[PDB]
């Protein structure tokens, strides 16, 4: 019943920004953190950061400090990640993944991922 539904594929120009969404359902949104992870071929997984939907507190990978902005909207149980100043390096599949942290830690449910392609308008 737990589901993490991410937004559809995105195609954006270099230098632009984009906002990805992760709609949560089947659980208490504010009870779990939400991580964002970047997947590029041959580059396994790369942590972007996480947000505590209770207060919206964030912790980032210093590499993504100036790249990503994590937010949430409690009412719609949706977590967002904005990526700015896009370059071909940002082309990847992005996931959201919830984490339990009360007494212990663990990932469990992951979104299906959203593909982002940074492409120049011919």
């Amino acid at each position: 019943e737990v589901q993490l539904q991410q937004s559809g594929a995105e195609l954006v120009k270099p230098g632009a920004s984009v906002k990805l969404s992760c709609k949560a359902s089947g659980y208490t949104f504010t009870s779990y953190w939400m991580h964002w992870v970047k997947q590029r071929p041959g580059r396994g997984l790369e942590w972007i950061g996480r947000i505590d939907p209770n207060g919206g507190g964030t912790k980032y990978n210093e590499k993504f400090k100036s790249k990503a902005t994590l937010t949430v909207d409690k009412p719609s149980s949706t977590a967002y990640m904005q990526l700015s100043s896009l370059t071909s390096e940002d082309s990847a599949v992005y996931y959201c993944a919830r984490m339990w942290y009360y007494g212990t830690y663990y990932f469990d449910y992951w979104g299906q991922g959203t593909t982002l392609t940074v492409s120049s308008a011919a």
């Binding site: 997984l45 942590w47 980032y60 599949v93 984490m99 212990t104 830690y105 663990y106 990932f107 469990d108």
Partner: protein, 108 residues
């Protein structure tokens, strides 16, 4: 800090196989809260274990986590055909999380 895993391991159905997670800074400790995540074809990710040895609810008991020597380990006791997948570990370093390169597990 850089996290290292075996590139690829081969096991047979019903056997016990151990995947490891290495920290370049030194020995993996409980303070690294080792996680293990499974990736199946079609970009299907599932969390298995966190905090070194805590299995997420609903995860098969055959998956267990521990610290073996200087590394964190994921032990699959009685590998199933469906266990063939890519396994990623991720260690916490006092503010940030770092993923290992992933291990491709083949089940003959």
């Amino acid at each position: 800090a850089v996290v290292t895993q075996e590139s690829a391991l081969t096991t047979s159905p019903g056997e016990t196989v151990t995947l490891t997670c290495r920290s370049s800074t030194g020995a993996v400790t409980t303070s690294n809260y080792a996680n293990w995540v499974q990736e199946k074809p079609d970009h299907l990710f599932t969390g298995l274990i966190g905090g070194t040895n805590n299995r997420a609810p609903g995860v098969p008991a055959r998956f267990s986590g521990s610290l073996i020597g200087n590394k964190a380990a994921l032990t699959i006791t009685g590998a199933q055909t469906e266990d063939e997948a890519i396994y990623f570990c991720a260690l916490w370093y006092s503010n940030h999380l770092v993923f290992g390169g992933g291990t491709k597990l083949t089940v003959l």
